[PDB]
Each structure stands twice: as C-alpha cells, then as structure tokens.
Design a protein around this nucleic acid. Sequence first.
RNA 1: UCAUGUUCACAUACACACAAACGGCGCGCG
RNA 2: CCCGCAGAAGAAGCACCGGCUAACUCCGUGCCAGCAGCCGCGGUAAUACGGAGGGUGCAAGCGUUAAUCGGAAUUACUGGGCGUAAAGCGCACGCAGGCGGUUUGUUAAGUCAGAUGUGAAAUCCCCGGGCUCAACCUGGGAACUGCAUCUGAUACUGGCAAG
Lengths: 156, 122, 205, 50, 209, 78
Amino acid sequence: ELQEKLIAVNRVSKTVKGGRIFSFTALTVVGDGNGRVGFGYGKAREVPAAIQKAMEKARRNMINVALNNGTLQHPVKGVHTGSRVFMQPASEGTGIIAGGAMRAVLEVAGVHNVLAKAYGSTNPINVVRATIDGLENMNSPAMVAAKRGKSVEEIL
Amino acid sequence: ATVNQLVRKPRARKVAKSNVPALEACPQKRGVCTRVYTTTPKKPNSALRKVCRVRLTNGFEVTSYIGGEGHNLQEHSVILIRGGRVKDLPGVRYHTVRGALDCSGVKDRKQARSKYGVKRPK
Amino acid sequence: ARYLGPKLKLSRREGTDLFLKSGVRAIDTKCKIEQAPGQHGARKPRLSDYGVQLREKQKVRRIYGVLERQFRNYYKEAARLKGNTGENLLALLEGRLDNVVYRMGFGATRAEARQLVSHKAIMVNGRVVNIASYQVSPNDVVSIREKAKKQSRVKAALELAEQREKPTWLEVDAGKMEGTFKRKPERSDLSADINEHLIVELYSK
Amino acid sequence: ERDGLFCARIFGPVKDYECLCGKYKRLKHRGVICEKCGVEVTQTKVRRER
Amino acid sequence: GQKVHPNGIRLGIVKPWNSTWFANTKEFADNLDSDFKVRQYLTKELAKASVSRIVIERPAKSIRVTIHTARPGIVIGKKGEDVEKLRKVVADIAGVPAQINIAEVRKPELDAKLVADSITSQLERRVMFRRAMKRAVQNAMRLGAKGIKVEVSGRLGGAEIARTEWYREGRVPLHTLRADIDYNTSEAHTTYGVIGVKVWIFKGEILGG
Amino acid sequence: GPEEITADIPNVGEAALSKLDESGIVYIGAEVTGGDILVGKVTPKVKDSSLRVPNGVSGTVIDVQVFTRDGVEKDKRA
RNA sequence: UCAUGUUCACAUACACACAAACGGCGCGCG
RNA sequence: CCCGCAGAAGAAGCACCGGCUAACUCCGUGCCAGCAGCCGCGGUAAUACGGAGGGUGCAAGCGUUAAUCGGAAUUACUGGGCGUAAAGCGCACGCAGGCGGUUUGUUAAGUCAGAUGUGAAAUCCCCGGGCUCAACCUGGGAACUGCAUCUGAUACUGGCAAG
Ligand SMILES: [Mg+2]
Ligand SMILES: [Mg+2]
Ligand SMILES: [Mg+2]
Ligand SMILES: [Mg+2]
Ligand SMILES: [Mg+2]
Ligand SMILES: [Mg+2]
Ligand SMILES: [Mg+2]
Ligand SMILES: [Mg+2]
Ligand SMILES: [Mg+2]
Ligand SMILES: [Mg+2]
Ligand SMILES: [Mg+2]
Ligand SMILES: [Mg+2]
Ligand SMILES: [Mg+2]
Ligand SMILES: [Mg+2]
Ligand SMILES: [Mg+2]
Ligand SMILES: [Mg+2]
Ligand SMILES: [Mg+2]
Ligand SMILES: [Mg+2]
Ligand SMILES: [Mg+2]
Ligand SMILES: [Mg+2]
Ligand SMILES: [Mg+2]
Ligand SMILES: [Mg+2]
Ligand SMILES: [Mg+2]
Ligand SMILES: [Zn+2]
C-alpha cells in the first residue's frame, strides 16, 4: 500500500554575489507493490523538505506496469540520456539481482525476480528514468493479443 | 566496426603495462642502497620524505620509499623492496620492507606491527 | 575455530536475543540489553544497506556458532542445491548436529550441545559422532549414551527443554534420551525474524 | 493470552491492520503469517468473523 | 547587517518600560544598581519556574516587583512559602519594603523569553537544534502568532565552524514601529561553547499606542 | 505508570489552558462551556486524558474539592 | 600609451489512522 | 580405532575503526614527525599521524606485495563510437577484395534435418556409495558445444544456363 523509499539525496549549489547557496535534491520512488511505480525528484534548501517534495511529486504521476507473476514479461531494454539499462525476467526464487537505484524502483514496483544491469552512465536520476521507461514500454500477452487481433492461446 | 574490417584486422587487446616493472612480476626483490637521502613532496604537502636509490639484483636502479620513523640505512645496505607507490613523491614506485634483510623494525610501535617488522611486546 | 568471548556482548551488538545463555535468568537482568556494546553504544548511526545485511548475517552466525569460511561454504552448497537458496541455507544450519541436539534438548545452550558432541557423548545411529558440523539426515535417530545419560547437566537441560517450545520436525524421548530427526525442518517452522534473503544477497554481491 | 479464548492467532489480530508480535505493520505484508508468535496480519474486522 | 533592538526601538510607542519610577540624579544610579541586583537574583532563583519579565516599580521608599511567569503555581508555592521568602530577601537586597505580585502568562507560546528559554534548555540537553527550532516556530504559528522568527548561532551540533541558521513564518515587520514585535535572547552553554538564540514574535500591528 | 495533573498538557495550547491555574485545576469562578478543560490530567506512555466539560452543558464553576492518598504530595489547590 | 599580484587552505548530508458500554436494583414520566 | 587416568588443566592472534567500508573517543605532536588503495589527512581542539581505551572483521591464522580474470559495454562477435568530447583520408579515379534489382530452370557448395563413427581416462556438473563429518576417494549418468562420412529438403545465399 504505497511503499516508498528514497534512492539518493544530493547537495547542489548556486553561486551569488554573496557566496555559495547550497541546496539539496532528493530522488524518491514510491509504488504499490502490484505494478504501480512512480518516481519523484524534489529540491529544497534542507533535506527533509526536499524529501517531502519528492514524495509528493512521486505519489502523483505514478505509472502502472503489466507484471507477470512478480517478474518481468519479456527481456526489455531502456535508454535515456546516458543510462542504458537491460533487464531480463528470471525464475521464481532468484531474487532481484539489480544495481542500486535500479533495485529500488524495481522493488517498489513489486518485481521479485529480475536480472538487471545499468550500462552507460549510472547517474541515479537518469537510471531511474531509464528503468521506468523500460518497464512501461512492456506489453503483456493480453495486450499483444489485443493488438494483433488474436487469442492468447494462438500466441502462447 | 564493419565485420569486414574486423575480419581483416581484429580488435587489439590493450596491453597494460605494470606500475612496478623493476619487480618483473616478483613480489619482492633485493637491492643494495646506492644512496639514502631525503626529498621534498609534491604540491599540497610538506615533509622530508626518506628515499633510497637502490641497485637491484636484476640490474635496475630504482628509488624506494622508507616508511616508519627512523631507519638504520646507509650505503651498501642490502634491503628488500616491495610494490607500492607514494603518490606523494614523484617517480617513487617501491617501498622498502621494514623488518627484513638489513632494515630494522620501527621502534615502540604497538599497532600495525606486522607492517613494520616489529615483534610482539610482552 | 570457536568464538571465545562474551555472549551477552554478542547479543547486545546484534540487537536481538541470540539465545547464548540458558534463560534461567533474564538477559535484561544479566546485562544492559537496551544499551549497545562499548564505550559508544548509546549512539545509532544510520546503517547502510551493506551494513544492515552484515548485521543480520552476524546475528544468524552468532546464533549457530559458525565461522565465516564454514558459513560461506554452507551458502555455496545451498545455492548449488535445487530450490530456494535462503530456505536451503536455513535448512542446512538447522541440520547441523549440534543444533539438532540443542533442539532435542540435551544441551541448555548450543554451546553446551557443541561441547557434548565434541566430548563424544552423542551417538547418531549407534555410532559416537564427534563432529559438530555433522549433517544429520531425515529419519536419523540420535541418542545420549548411558555414560552421559547419568549427567546432571543433561537432565537439567531436559528440564529446561521441557520448559522450551518443542520442534515439530523432531521427536524426542526424555527417558530414553533419544530423538528421531524425522525430516529437515521447513522455513515456516523456523523463526520468521531471520531474513535469510539478506544473507543470500550479501554473499551474492 | 495465547490459545486462550482471545488468542490473536486463533481468531485474528487485535490492532487495526497490524500484527501482535510487532514484526509487521504495513499493508504490504497483508496476509503474511509470522513466526514469532504465529498471528496472521489482516483486517482486525475479521476478528469478529472467525 | 546589524539590526537595532526592537524593544529599545519601540519603547514609549507601543511598548512599556520594565521599570517605572522617578528618581533624581542623586538616587538614580543607586536605584539602577538595586534593580540590577534584584532582577539578577530573581531570575537565578526562579529559573526553573520559568520567569518571563520582572517589572520593578518603586514608590515612596518601597519596591513593587511584578514577575511575569508561565507557571505561577510553582512560583507561588503552596502556603506562599517561596513568595514570602523571596519578598523578604528582595527587601533586604533593596533596603526598602518589598511587595511581590505574580502575573500568569496565559499564552506562553507567544512569549519571546519563554520560547528562547525552552530552546536553550533543549540545546543544553543536546537535542538537534534544527528540530527544536522548527518545533518552536510551528508551535507559535499554531497558537496564533501573526508571525515568528527564530535565529540560532554558533557551534551548532558541536560543529567546529560556527554558523547562524534562522526560520521565519508569517510576517515579521521589523521596520514598522507600530508593529508589536516581542523580542528576546538566550544562550545555551553547551560543552562546545555558547550558542545564541534570538526570537522575534510579531503579535500584530497596534494602532492606538 | 502514575498519572499527573498539570498545565503542561501535550498537544494543547493556551487557547484552552487559559482557564486553568498553574496547578492544573480550574479557577473558582471560571465560567465554562463544552470542551473546556477543567482538570489537566495526563497519563504516561504522554496522553492528555484530562477532564473536559461534557458536550452541551454550561455553567459557572462554584467549587472544587481535592482528595489524596496517604504518602502522596499536595499542591497549592490542596 | 598603462605591466604585475608568492604557497596551501571553504560545513551545514533523514510514523499514518484512531472519540464513552453492559447487567441488575430502584424512582419517575408518560 | 577403542578403553582407562588425572586435571581447566597444555593451547589466540592479525588487520582495521574520515568516506568508498562494518567499527569512536581521549592523550601526544603541530605542514614537523608521519599516513595513503583512491579521495586526501597533518600549519596548536588531528574520529585520517603515534600511544591508550573501546569497537569492528577474520581466526590458527591475519595482513602486505606480485599476478590473472571480473567489475571494464574501457578493443564493444553477443556489446561502442566518429558536427562540437579521441575519431570522416583535402578531393577524385580505380585493380585485388566486400556486397549485388528482378524471373525461370538446374545444381546442391554454403544452409538445414536425420543417421553412423569418433570426440581417451581424469576434471566440471547430477543422483548415489565409502572415509565419524568435510575435504578426499569413488559407481553410474549427463556433458564433451567439435570433427568426419552418408542419406534427404530447395526457402535463402553461391555456381552454371537462359530471360
Ligand atoms: Mg600544504
Ligand atoms: Mg579452519
Ligand atoms: Mg557475480
Ligand atoms: Mg546601526
Ligand atoms: Mg613579474
Ligand atoms: Mg596567483
Ligand atoms: Mg561505517
Ligand atoms: Mg599529537
Ligand atoms: Mg594506518
Ligand atoms: Mg596542535
Ligand atoms: Mg582513514
Ligand atoms: Mg592512527
Ligand atoms: Mg570486456
Ligand atoms: Mg565510447
Ligand atoms: Mg578541441
Ligand atoms: Mg578532416
Ligand atoms: Mg571531407
Ligand atoms: Mg540477388
Ligand atoms: Mg559475386
Ligand atoms: Mg551440402
Ligand atoms: Mg556420505
Ligand atoms: Mg572425457
Ligand atoms: Mg540462385
Ligand atoms: Zn507478526
């Protein structure tokens, strides 16, 4: 029921006539454990505020994913700025074999058995972006049947 | 990239040089201190770091850091050197081993004794 | 090959009760169970993922009394075996002979059980077995020999066990001092507080 | 008192949607059965049903 | 840049004085000294009973002190043992007949001195400064301050480098003279040194004077 | 553990507490209405369980009485 | 037309929801 | 291997504790002495040097050095790029080479399918068995992704012939 966890919190600065202005960025990710996942990127002058903003953002604009029995539906690639990610469904009991950020998003989503790798850049924000894109861009056998105008048994 | 190109001339594995080529894939090596002196560190540090130019058994003339406070070294003193750089001194790639052939262990050390060739007090 | 040190210390560090003492006297009375071990115990830095996994692993290892090489080996074997790795690992740990004797109730602690096994007090299928790591198999009867049957410690242990909760996967006779290892215990029968999955991940990084 | 006329593992948990042994306190665990005391984590409403 | 004291900049106008007596220049310094002594004593004695504002007013060779305090019951004591004792000690210190009155602070969340003291106590007992300050501001806002500012300064969390942090909520118009700005200060004497607390509480904008 | 009577009630501000004295009992002659706290009792592990005037009723508080066990401390309303 | 500025050295970094209960004994109103 | 004797008796160290990385305080020194795998630490309050206490990790071992693969999608066949980050020959012509629109026929080299032979034993893996357990030994399988030969399919690619 909307379990959420913060991946990374990072301090960033702007410079002004006076001196430096520090601020914090919090990348959180929430999900219901049944398919729905949404990430949020909050920024505030102090960490707790940043985290709260991130949580609110994440809670809205979540996204549902067609998950098959607590794992992926087919091997899926995902790309974004630099973070290019590969993730493959694996047999029940393997557990989530997945990096950091990646592990978080998958875990909140509710996938229990995946083999992932983050290629390219591993910038948390981008990797989360990639993972969510990859998860979304994954249809189920119901969906493919609907698209092609067939029964699921014809497709298998 | 094109398979034809690869077929003609395949991809060269990147032959990585060693950072300790005087060892010649030996874990240590014996040498004779040609000369033992102090030298100034690189830019964000101040010290007088002890170092010795050593003629190795296999011909090479290296320079080796000498860790620990105080040492019994001079010319014609057979010592064993090991792999490891001092980031700090430019061009120094080897440590002397404290507690071998002709190097004493550090005095009054109670911690990391194994690293400094110091026997267990009682 | 054995941990030779304070036991409540181990428990304090982990957080949980590892059952390293007989339980006549409560551990809160025997030690400051609330306060963590050392000069700087009353401080809780936020623990990393690695750290948390390590702490749990330590907990299980301390509970059973397995050193690291042996534990790693157990994990490897469990992984090799078919089915779930964590479940398998727990089963192996339970299977250990010292653990089995403790479950049966001839030793107050696992330490006591281990000592008995070492000293050749315990026969598995009528053969004095000496190894604590000896894997007991299903349907294996394991019994106290008569010379150790006269041990007041053994009888005391039995009384303590009678107080304790009996395991479903063993059957033990207090007068005969013999127990039949009927089947390797299931995970639902074992304690839920152990998160074997963390151990598996740690040994899979 | 467990296995008495109110035992939370016979009938069900007392707290609103959370378990007695303390191990689980969130809807994610809904329907797990613990191994500290053995209670099922579920709607406390069902404590009047069973 | 260095701000003028809001009480001293507001005296007369919206704010009353904490001392109200006449004296010629012969007796003036002495009177001041007596006030300093008694005030110091009173704060020291009733620090635990939370004491917000002593108001001294002496007519006709006699002093009338008025202690504004969040919890009078502890200031008065049962049977009036402590009030009586204080009266007598105060009288001896002054050298005139004393009279103590005790004003009950109904809104101690809207009192700069009280807030500062609470924050200081927490700081002394090693709470997280930021958390304590946040709690103080939120509480005042909830209670209905038109605004509040709190500043803490120096060796925060035992950090080697000193810094000042401040939180503001609502409006706190310092340049408006008719603005009823309550202000006060305190110091937490921690193991790492002194840590200063300043607290402004904008009650609202008085138009009568 | 043992309860206290106090003005230091958690989770309530001077908006209500203005009618209690410093001990934790209402002033005599306080005029009161629904939800006014008459007696600021609190329970450990702190819970604000205090006597509030029940809904609907209203009146002037004409008197209070205080009763205490042996070996227990008084207060200035006692 | 109007050059130059010795060396190093810049922290703040985590609970949600929850508002009084059940039986005698009485008196009284309708 | 078994039995008996005595008595806790004869038997615990090594590294680390700023971050990565599990584990923090005090004293000593004061850009010195020193540390360091990386980033760095030390100029008078050193959780980074040295000592102490406490803790953490391994344990009859523990550290350091060397070396290989991994992480390194960092030689990218699976699985990289080339406007500005390293990277498009200054531009063309052109032999060897690489690739080749469309139709039909034939062939069967590539390709595919099946069979036969072989691919030593050991090793790896699986189910067993024996050493008290393990390591270790060991029975039987599986695997040994290969290679050769023969017999088929004509889709595609190749050859030859015609368009
Ligand atoms: Mg410098
Ligand atoms: Mg061993
Ligand atoms: Mg691996
Ligand atoms: Mg000025
Ligand atoms: Mg010049
Ligand atoms: Mg310059
Ligand atoms: Mg740590
Ligand atoms: Mg020092
Ligand atoms: Mg060191
Ligand atoms: Mg100094
Ligand atoms: Mg360090
Ligand atoms: Mg040190
Ligand atoms: Mg590679
Ligand atoms: Mg590249
Ligand atoms: Mg350029
Ligand atoms: Mg060019
Ligand atoms: Mg060009
Ligand atoms: Mg063609
Ligand atoms: Mg051709
Ligand atoms: Mg052919
Ligand atoms: Mg066997
Ligand atoms: Mg073979
Ligand atoms: Mg053709
Ligand atoms: Zn539970």
